């Protein structure tokens, strides 16, 4: 309900690197005072959360246009089992930056060869039990 996100995806086989472009976003819900939020998008490889990339902060727009580009130096063999995460955050100067949305893209569903660029609907990020342990015994 927050809005949609237009992004670009393609792989450069000449340098063996992933080219992820953040085009823009639309119809984002407002969380700030003026009637518009201050959005910025954090993008990182889904498999390992290392070297996350963040875009510049846009002031008071529910339709931010970033038109930015990020490069993930990852071989083509490892790429297949690697996912992409694009999460939209709301900037706040005096508090925690609340997450507006998130989107995950499996690299086995992605087809490289033609330059991909699409709009995808944003969804609410996941917050389960912490322990995840089990004990087995018998009663008689």
């Amino acid at each position: 309900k927050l809005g949609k996100l237009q992004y670009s995806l393609d792989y450069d086989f000449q340098n063996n690197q992933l080219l992820v472009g953040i085009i823009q976003a639309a119809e984002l819900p407002a969380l700030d005072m003026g009637g518009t939020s201050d959005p910025y998008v954090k993008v990182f490889l889904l498999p390992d959360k290392k070297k996350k990339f963040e875009t510049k902060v846009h002031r008071k727009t529910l339709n931010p246009v970033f038109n930015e580009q990020f490069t993930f130096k990852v071989p083509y063999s490892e790429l297949g089992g690697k996912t992409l995460v694009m999460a939209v955050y709301d900037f706040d100067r005096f508090s925690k930056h609340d997450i507006i949305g998130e989107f995950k893209v499996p690299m086995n569903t992605v087809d490289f060869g033609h330059v991909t660029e699409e709009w995808r609907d944003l969804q609410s990020a996941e917050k389960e039990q912490e322990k995840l342990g089990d004990i087995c015994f018998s009663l008689r």
Binding site: D10, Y11, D12, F13, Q14, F112, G113, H114, V115
Partner: protein, 67 residues
């Protein structure tokens, strides 16, 4: 990039190779024609020198004939 970029790259490259090949063949034909024409010039110069000899002897004879 993608497979489209690589494919177009490959295509334009092949195009370049064919243009290059046509250039090559043109140069070959050039050398050929120039050579054959060279032989033609050989026989021309031959005939001309013979003509010069004949003319010279003729002129000598007439020059001795008039006086």
């Amino acid at each position: 990039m993608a497979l489209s970029e690589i494919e177009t790259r490959h295509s334009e490259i092949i195009k370049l190779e064919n243009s290059i090949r046509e250039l090559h063949d043109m140069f070959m034909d050039m050398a050929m024609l120039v050579e054959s024409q060279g032989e033609m010039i050989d026989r021309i110069e031959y005939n001309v020198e013979h003509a010069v000899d004949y003319v010279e002897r003729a002129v000598s004879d007439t020059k001795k004939a008039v006086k």
